[PDB]
Curated annotation (Swiss-Prot), chain A:
Sequence intervals crossing the membrane: none
Ranges where the record places region Interaction with BIN2: 1-83
Signal peptide feature range: none
Source organism of the structure: Homo sapiens (Human)
Superkingdom field: Eukaryota
Residues of the full protein shown: 40 to 271 of 593
Function: Is a key player in the control of plasma membrane curvature, membrane shaping and membrane remodeling. Required in muscle cells for the formation of T-tubules, tubular invaginations of the plasma membrane that function in depolarization-contraction coupling. Is a negative regulator of endocytosis. Is also involved in the regulation of intracellular vesicles sorting, modulation of BACE1 trafficking and the control of amyloid-beta production. In neuronal circuits, endocytosis regulation may influence the internalization of PHF-tau aggregates.
Tissue expression notes: Ubiquitous. Highest expression in the brain and muscle. Expressed in oligodendrocytes. Isoform IIA is expressed only in the brain, where it is detected in the gray matter, but not in the white matter. Isoform BIN1 is widely expressed with highest expression in skeletal muscle.
Listed name of the protein: Myc box-dependent-interacting protein 1
Disease with which this protein is associated in UniProt: Myopathy, centronuclear, 2: A congenital muscle disorder characterized by progressive muscular weakness and wasting involving mainly limb girdle, trunk, and neck muscles. It may also affect distal muscles. Weakness may be present during childhood or adolescence or may not become evident until the third decade of life. Ptosis is a frequent clinical feature. BIN1 mutations have been found in families segregating autosomal dominant centronuclear myopathy. Patients show adult-onset, mildly progressive muscle weakness affecting selected proximal muscles and all distal muscles of the lower limbs.
Domain BAR: 1-201
Coiled-coil features, chain-numbered ranges: 135-197
Subunit annotation: Heterodimer with AMPH. Binds SH3GLB1. Interacts (via SH3 domain) with DNM1. Interacts with SYNJ1. Interacts (via SH3 domain) with DNM2. Isoform IIA interacts with CLTC. Isoform IIB does not interact with CLTC. Isoform IIC1 does not interact with CLTC. Isoform IIC2 does not interact with CLTC. Interacts with AP2A2. Interacts with AP2B1. Interacts with MYC (via N-terminal transactivation domain); the interaction requires the integrity of the conserved MYC box regions 1 and 2. Interacts with BIN2. Interacts with SNX4. Interacts (via BAR domain) with BACE1. Binds (via BAR domain) F-actin. (Microbial infection) Interacts (SH3 domain) with HCV NS5A.
Post-translational modification: Phosphorylated by protein kinase C.
Swiss-Prot record, chain B:
Complete-protein stretch covered: 42 to 270 of 593
Tissue expression pattern: Ubiquitous. Highest expression in the brain and muscle. Expressed in oligodendrocytes. Isoform IIA is expressed only in the brain, where it is detected in the gray matter, but not in the white matter. Isoform BIN1 is widely expressed with highest expression in skeletal muscle.
Subunit and partners: Heterodimer with AMPH. Binds SH3GLB1. Interacts (via SH3 domain) with DNM1. Interacts with SYNJ1. Interacts (via SH3 domain) with DNM2. Isoform IIA interacts with CLTC. Isoform IIB does not interact with CLTC. Isoform IIC1 does not interact with CLTC. Isoform IIC2 does not interact with CLTC. Interacts with AP2A2. Interacts with AP2B1. Interacts with MYC (via N-terminal transactivation domain); the interaction requires the integrity of the conserved MYC box regions 1 and 2. Interacts with BIN2. Interacts with SNX4. Interacts (via BAR domain) with BACE1. Binds (via BAR domain) F-actin. (Microbial infection) Interacts (SH3 domain) with HCV NS5A.
Post-translational modification remark: Phosphorylated by protein kinase C.
Disease: Myopathy, centronuclear, 2: A congenital muscle disorder characterized by progressive muscular weakness and wasting involving mainly limb girdle, trunk, and neck muscles. It may also affect distal muscles. Weakness may be present during childhood or adolescence or may not become evident until the third decade of life. Ptosis is a frequent clinical feature. BIN1 mutations have been found in families segregating autosomal dominant centronuclear myopathy. Patients show adult-onset, mildly progressive muscle weakness affecting selected proximal muscles and all distal muscles of the lower limbs.
Name of the protein in question: Myc box-dependent-interacting protein 1
Length: 201, 191
């Protein structure tokens, strides 16, 4: 039951470790998207550079390069708003639970100390009733302090653990939903450029 | 003159072409980086997917297909866009050398004429030199006068074909990826 609680603690550290990695990979994916965007803009700038203003389709190829720019921007901004910054509430939960767990640990040590002291007094050599009285009071106090920390963690850790499912499912549904749409809209731009370039064949 | 405007066009064609090669190479590197980051994200889903959630196997097949798609996309860009960019650019160095060399063979001939002119005011020999210098210059001149316009013309076809090839292979990549993301959204909706 130390054991029951230590399992919650081990689940909590795993949940914390996995949720940290998922964001970092999200962050890295985000930075990829931005660099793919910048590279695509330079590549389109090469086409614009050679495409003369009077050649048929020039203005339209331009329109398409600007739509491409906008599409990458919107994908990246939506990923940020809908998948990355939507994690805030959930991860925000962790720091203070971690802290409360280490504090529960110290209050348990304090409680164990006060038990040990109370115990040393019960095996005199005539009992010193007054010292017993104070040690008993310190024991009961340190037990209450420990037991409050303990009771709130015991309901809170299973609740958090269970919510990890929702978090993962929702984050990946937002990313996959956004991604389906981006790639759909993309392909249309590729098609539009292709039809313009058919004119110069 | 005419030949100097041809040389100018050529310098420009080489500059644009080199910039396109540099930018394509970057684009291919970015496509690889976006593949790898996407793959890692997928791996985070795979590592958290519980055995008692339905669709675990289907999610692994989707991720495997996703990896293969990205790999196919990058490889078609190499084959259809980049290695063709390289062949077109491979003709430029020798022509560039031949422009510089023609320039020198022109001064060579001018100074052989300015010398047959100078003596005539030993002459048996200078006229020999002038004929050799004329035959060597004019042989470079004619070859470049054909070749520079014909290279210049081919620029449009090379750009059109490069950018059409990209837009076709990208259309297919994006259409196919869109379907794979839809397949993953359907699995996830069922949790
Ligand atoms: Xe073009
Ligand atoms: Xe998930």
């Amino acid at each position: 039951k130390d054991e029951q609680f230590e399992q919650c603690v081990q689940n909590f550290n795993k949940q914390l470790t996995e949720g940290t990695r998922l964001q970092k990979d999200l962050r890295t994916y985000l930075a990829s998207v931005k660099a793919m965007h910048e590279a695509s803009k330079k590549l389109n700038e090469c086409l614009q550079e050679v495409y003369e203003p009077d050649w048929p389709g020039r203005d339209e190829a331009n329109k398409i390069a600007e739509n491409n720019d906008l599409l990458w921007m919107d994908y990246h901004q939506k990923l940020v708003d809908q998948a990355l910054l939507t994690m805030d509430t959930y991860l925000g939960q962790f720091p203070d639970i971690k802290s409360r767990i280490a504090k529960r640990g110290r209050k348990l040590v304090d409680y164990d100390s006060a038990r040990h002291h109370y115990e040393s007094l019960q095996t005199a050599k005539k009992k010193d009733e007054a010292k017993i009285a104070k040690a008993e009071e310190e024991l009961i106090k340190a037990q209450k302090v420990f037991e409050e920390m303990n009771v709130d963690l015991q309901e809170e850790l299973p609740s958090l653990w269970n919510s990890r499912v929702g978090f993962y499912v929702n984050t990946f549904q937002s990313i996959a939903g956004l991604e389906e749409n981006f790639h759909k809209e993309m392909s249309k731009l590729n098609q539009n450029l292709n039809d313009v370039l058919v004119g110069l064949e």
